[PDB]
Design a protein around this ligand. Structure first.
Ligand SMILES: Nc1ncnc2c1ncn2[C@@H]1O[C@H](COP(=O)(O)OP(=O)(O)O)[C@@H](O)[C@H]1O
Ligand SMILES: Nc1ncnc2c1ncn2[C@@H]1O[C@H](COP(=O)(O)OP(=O)(O)O)[C@@H](O)[C@H]1O
Ligand SMILES: [Zn+2]
Lengths: 92, 193, 638
């Protein structure tokens, strides 16, 4: 029954996160962060919205979405680099 | 439903209820929670399509319940098909070939992915299977369909199902001093889906 | 009573007049002169000439078509007597066809019209049409024209007659297999297959893989509890609106036609203009040419996608499936040589071994989309080699050998080994298959997804709009503006383009092709590579429907070829830069691209193009390595 819709209000929040993740993977052995990886943030936001049975992707839903997606890329890094990206993405 | 729906902060209620008899692993249970609900399979303007279900890969050391969660998604999702790495074949997953006992014609029979349409597919020990058995999964994770060309049968089936996979790192222990792309026998393509 | 039906047919042949001529009398007379004992009757003339017999023929052709055979035979023999066997009836019609899935238990013994593609054919067999028999008991003789021999003599015991072989007549018959178009079949369904039979002059017209239009009789015959196998007695086989022609001609007259269609290909994706344009060339394809020795040049344009994962390369193939009128999509893993190419199997309906086509046979005259091309076995690749470079498939199974043509355009997407294409390595090392395959594809595209700031933001904004639903309104407005073409209309345009025009090159385009390719050859690619560019300019001319291919098509074709094949006196200046840089930079030293610009180009020691080409050449000669998008340059070797 639930199919939440989207409004492009948080576009700057997601786009800059996507750019930030790509920049930190340019020279580090890590996940193949691509367009398909950005789509996970939006789709996983839909799941959080679809948990509330709401019809709208709110700002909060993306907030849970971005934290889950960005943390995954940070955790799967070598020890010497993990502690640096810990603080580089503290905004998110 | 709407009584629970109006409860403040429902998201943490669902996540806390994902297999409650497993301690910790909250950043993993949220992936299970998000994959069970799925997304929106947006057939954008008809001419474009994007999958909606969330694919999850569980990786880590033995003794971390990477498999028993997949023994929970089976009992919770509406339609779930469970498989094991070395116990599954390429033909047995995608589709099989049969001859009609009445009309003597070539007929096709659906596999694990075809069964799990509008459901979930659960693969255990994803790394230990042979390369060819792992290769057929590529189409399902992005197209949600099975493409076959065998014995004069040229068609495509519907395989809309999320895939939850458990695996082990090379050597059986995870080397935290090395990248993930180096810790597993898989490759960027397979990890990309 | 039935004599009126014969008389009406006689008027419809001898006396029917169209275009102020006795067309049916003349065409039958011409057939008699040719000695072809067949007549092609147009059903649209029959309804306009006599509707009453049309009602009987459409409803109960059980006795009408026996009357057709005997009346035409009498009339044609009358013409032969006037001018100086049983004549076969052939029906041509343009009435609406019934879908193959719409055939039911109600159209039994009714003449129906169908359209589809032949997937398998049988060998010819002889069937009796006229017989003479003799009683073994008393030598009583008689003639006979299902049919079974008499049980008792007419003069002797049960079944006393035997066949007089030297005074009997027989006719040839063939059995065909027809199935509906796979493009019209929704996913999750195998196209329905229907058995058809043809005799005399209608035999051997169509091979497996041929798309046909059918006029025939729907019926059943025994061969489940009572499941009778349906079959068709073939009566006639054939194999755009004026406003649509003007609409598509106006599309050809559009000043931005090439760019509008280029944008129209997968509008949901951003940028990727070069790969879009090559796939557009794939849709049109080249123009066919035949050597004076009889050989044929392959006109298909085959392209290989050979880049990093997650670059919409899989989505590009899927869109082509929805735009190509003849489209087949299959994976490398779920395919076999017998499944892809032709095969030999025994038909259980007629208990005979039939030659049966495969996926690569169905896609004849169209485009096939194969994915994970690297993952298929070598034997499947070997069979593809014959199709790619000869447009033929040779079958040798059991104890029979045959060769079957396949004009298949192949769009292959391959995942390079090691996951990511390493620029430090030759393309041969980043590939796991036979090196000769590299000589098959006309073009290859090693796409790259190096991380960047401003391009990612622009792409990311595009994606958000799509999930927002704004793209639906944006595309419709763009369609209203004319900058984007509907997927159905484009397919209608492409189908119109394929059937109507067949361009040929101009000397101005050819002379530049030779000159540029000479420079490519001298710097180093085979002689074959230049002729592959000929297909591209033919394809672009096909899209514009220009009578001749033009040099202005070659410029993009050369650029596309350079941007595809070269993925991984001015030459003296370029090589002097190589000489100078080998002195400026010792082995193992590092610098930046902008540093060379300030030191070598700002001082005007060398031109910037020489800087670009020398860096391009030095990296391929293992001398230098470019790092961090040009922010660091390191000399790797001498
Ligand atoms: N976080 C956890 N909480 C509770 N039990 C756990 C946890 N991790 C592992 N276990 C226990 O360890 C076992 C792990 O089984 P299994 O899933 O096969 O391990 P693997 O991760 O090697 O697949 C389970 O029986 C489970 O009871
Ligand atoms: N330029 C682009 N514009 C829009 N979407 C893109 C673009 N590049 C990649 N994508 C996304 O990538 C996905 C297709 O990737 P795909 O080619 O299936 O990956 P793979 O190469 O592993 O098969 C689509 O969901 C699409 O949305
Ligand atoms: Zn007798």
């Amino acid at each position: 029954k639930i199919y939440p819709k989207l409004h492009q209000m948080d576009m700057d929040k997601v786009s800059r996160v996507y750019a930030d993740l790509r920049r930190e993977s340019i020279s580090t052995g890590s996940f193949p962060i691509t367009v398909r990886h950005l789509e996970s943030i939006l789709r996983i936001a839909e799941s959080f919205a679809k948990m509330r049975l709401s019809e709208f992707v709110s700002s909060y839903d993306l907030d849970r979405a971005i934290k889950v997606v960005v943390d995954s890329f940070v955790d799967a890094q070598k020890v010497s680099v993990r502690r640096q990206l810990r603080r580089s993405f503290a905004i998110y | 439903f709407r009584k629970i729906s109006r409860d403040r902060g429902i998201i943490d209620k669902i996540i806390s209820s994902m297999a409650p008899s497993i301690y910790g692993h909250r950043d993993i249970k949220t992936a299970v929670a998000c994959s069970l609900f799925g997304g929106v399979p947006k057939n954008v303007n008809g001419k474009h399509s994007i999958r909606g279900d969330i694919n999850v890969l569980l990786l880590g050391d033995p003794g971390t319940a990477k498999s028993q969660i997949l023994k929970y998604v089976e009992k919770t999702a509406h339609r779930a098909v469970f498989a094991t790495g070395q116990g599954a074949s390429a033909v047995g997953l995608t589709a099989s070939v049969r001859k009609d006992p009445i009309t003597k014609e070539w007929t096709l029979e659906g596999g694990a992915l075809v069964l799990a349409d509008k459901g979930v597919c659960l693969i255990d020990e994803f790394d230990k299977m042979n390369d060819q058995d792992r290769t057929s999964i590529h189409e399902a994770m992005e197209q949600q369909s099975i493409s076959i060309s065998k014995a004069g049968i040229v068609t495509t089936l519907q395989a809309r199902c999320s895939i939850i996979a458990a695996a082990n790192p090379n050597g059986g222990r995870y080397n935290s001093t090395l990248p993930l792309a180096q810790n597993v026998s898989l490759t960027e393509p397979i990890l990309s889906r | 009573d039935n004599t009126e039906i014969i008389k009406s047919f006689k008027n419809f042949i001898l006396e029917f007049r169209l275009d102020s001529q006795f067309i049916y009398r003349d065409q039958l007379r011409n057939n008699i002169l040719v000695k072809n004992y067949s007549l092609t009757v147009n059903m649209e003339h029959l309804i306009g000439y006599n509707e009453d017999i049309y009602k009987k023929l459409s409803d109960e052709p059980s006795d009408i078509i026996p009357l057709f055979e005997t009346a035409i035979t009498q009339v044609a023999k009358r013409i032969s007597i006037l001018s100086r066997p049983t004549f076969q009836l052939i029906l041509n019609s343009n009435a609406n066809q019934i879908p193959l899935r719409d055939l039911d238990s109600e159209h039994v013994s009714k003449i129906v019209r169908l359209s589809g593609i032949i997937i398998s054919t049988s060998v010819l067999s002889s069937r009796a049409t006229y017989l003479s028999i003799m009683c073994r008991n008393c030598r009583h003789t008689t003639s006979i024209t299902t049919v079974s021999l008499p049980r008792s003599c007419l003069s002797c015991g049960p079944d006393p007659y035997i066949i007089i072989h030297e005074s009997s007549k027989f006719i040839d018959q063939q059995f065909l297999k027809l199935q509906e178009i796979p493009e019209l079949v929704p996913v999750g369904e195998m196209p329905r297959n229907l058995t058809m039979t043809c005799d005399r002059y209608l035999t051997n017209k169509v091979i497996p893989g041929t798309r046909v239009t059918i006029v025939g009789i729907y019926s059943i015959y025994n061969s489940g509890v009572a499941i009778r196998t349906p079959y068709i007695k073939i009566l006639g086989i054939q194999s755009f609106t004026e406003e649509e022609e003007e609409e598509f001609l106006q599309l050809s007259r559009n000043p931005k036609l090439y760019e509008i269609l280029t944008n129209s290909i997968a509008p949901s994706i951003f940028g990727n203009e070069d790969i879009k344009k090559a796939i557009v060339c794939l849709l049109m394809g080249g123009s066919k040419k035949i050597l004076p020795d009889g050989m044929r040049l392959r006109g298909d344009i085959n392209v290989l996608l050979l880049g990093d994962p997650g670059t919409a390369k899989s989505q590009l193939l899927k869109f082509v499936e929805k735009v190509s009128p003849i489209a087949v999509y299959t994976s490398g893993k779920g395919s076999s040589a017998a499944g892809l190419t032709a095969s030999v199997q025994r038909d259980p309906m007629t208990r005979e071994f039939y030659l049966e086509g495969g996926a690569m046979v169905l896609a004849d005259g169209g485009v096939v989309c194969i994915d994970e091309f690297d993952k298929m076995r070598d034997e499947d690749r070997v069979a593809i080699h014959e199709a790619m470079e000869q447009q033929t498939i040779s079958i040798a199974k059991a104890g029979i050998t045959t060769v079957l043509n396949s004009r298949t355009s192949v769009l292959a997407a391959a995942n390079p080994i090691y996951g990511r294409y390493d620029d430090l390595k030759s393309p041969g090392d980043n590939i796991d298959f036979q090196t000769t395959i590299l000589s098959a594809f006309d073009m290859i595209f090693i796409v790259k997804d190096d991380h960047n700031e401003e391009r990612d933001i622009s792409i990311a904004n595009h994606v958000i709009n799509i999930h927002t639903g704004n793209a639906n309104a944006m595309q419709n407005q763009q369609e209203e503006n004319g900058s984007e073409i509907s997927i159905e209309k484009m397919k209608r345009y492409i189908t119109y383009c394929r059937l109507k025009c067949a361009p040929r090159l101009s000397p101005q385009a050819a002379e530049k092709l030779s000159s540029n390719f000479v420079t490519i050859r001298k710097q180093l690619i085979t002689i074959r590579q230049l002729e592959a560019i000929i297909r591209i300019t033919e394809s672009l001319a096909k899209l514009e429907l220009s009578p001749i291919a033009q040099e202005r098509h070659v410029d993009e074709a050369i650029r596309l070829f350079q941007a595809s094949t070269m993925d991984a006196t001015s030459l003296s200046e370029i090589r002097r830069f190589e000489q100078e840089l080998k002195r400026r930079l010792p082995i193992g030293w590092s610098t930046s691209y902008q540093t060379l610009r300030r030191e070598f180009v700002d001082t005007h020691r060398f031109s910037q193009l020489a800087l670009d080409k020398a860096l391009y050449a030095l990296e391929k000669h293992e001398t230098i390595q470019l790092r961090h998008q040009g922010q660091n340059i390191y000399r790797s070797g001498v």
